[PDB]
């Protein structure tokens, strides 16, 4: 996260770290959606152009974390993956269209002060909150700038951007399965996600029922926090039929 701040304790109890066993390292963020299911970006698990194709046994999920590097004894929980499920029409060839995956955990994680699921949006909540200018919140342990790493989880609030402004910022084809967020060049505020934040959540707090909803998944950006560029997020509501089909089946 670029131009964010340190998270407060238990501020994002759904935040998940995707952790490589191999060389022990941070791969991505992710989110807890129930005691057995974690949501992330497909490109955190599969990205042929960079020879990425992880299997269940390569990875752990670390839940309840605040420190990036510390083993947070009695706070974090570390979970093994039973099964990865990648959207069958994830487009890694062109523009990361449908950048979404689920991971089923071997065992249910115990909820605590630090560990608690986020809600997934219904059509009504999506229609109300996904409006240009409404702010969401992005969290992760990725780079503090495009070209340091944080001691602790970082947070930034960013406004949703009008679709034409998103399309006009980039040569990449923007789909209805994506939305963009960030400040315009001379607004006086900035900030973005960056390398290592992808797969983490873009959340909004409903003013109707005071619950947090995951509207997006950190997907991609040109660099981090560039003037005139925006961050692109997977539109979670648009892909909720697939999410429901995977959980109902498995």
């Amino acid at each position: 996260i670029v131009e964010g701040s340190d998270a407060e304790i238990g501020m994002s109890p759904w935040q998940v770290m995707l952790f490589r066993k191999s060389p022990q390292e941070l791969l991505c963020g992710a989110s807890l959606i129930s005691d057995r299911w974690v949501l992330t970006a497909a490109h955190c698990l599969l990205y042929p152009p960079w020879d990425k194709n992880f299997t269940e046994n390569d990875l752990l999920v670390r839940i309840g974390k605040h420190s990036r590097t510390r083993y947070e004894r009695n706070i974090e929980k570390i979970s093994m993956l039973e099964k990865i499920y990648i959207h069958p029409r994830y487009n890694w060839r062109e523009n990361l269209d449908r950048d979404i995956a689920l991971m089923k955990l071997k065992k249910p994680v115990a909820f605590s002060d630090y560990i608690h699921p986020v809600c997934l949006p219904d059509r009504e909540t999506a229609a109300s909150l996904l409006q240009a200018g409404y702010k969401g919140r992005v969290t992760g342990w990725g780079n503090l700038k495009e070209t340091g790493q944080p001691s602790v989880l970082q947070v930034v609030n960013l406004p949703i951007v009008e679709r034409p402004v998103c399309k006009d910022s980039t040569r990449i084809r923007i789909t209805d399965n994506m939305f963009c967020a960030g400040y315009k060049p001379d607004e006086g505020k900035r900030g973005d996600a960056c390398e290592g934040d992808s797969g983490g959540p873009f959340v909004m707090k409903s003013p109707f029922n005071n619950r947090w909803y995951q509207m997006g998944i950190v997907s991609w950006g040109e660099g981090c926090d560039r003037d005139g560029k925006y961050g692109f997020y997977t539109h979670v509501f648009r892909l909720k039929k697939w999410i429901q089909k995977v959980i109902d089946q498995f």
């Binding site: 238990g10 699921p117 609030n157 409903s206 003013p207």
Partner: peptide, 27 residues
């Protein structure tokens, strides 16, 4: 049924330092 309500915030009626920035944008 308990999704999206944080033990250290909503469940205790405590606000985090920047959530009001989100509410204020929902105009």
């Amino acid at each position: 049924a308990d999704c999206g309500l944080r033990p250290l915030f909503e469940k205790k009626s405590l606000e985090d330092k920047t959530e009001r920035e989100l509410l204020e944008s929902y105009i």
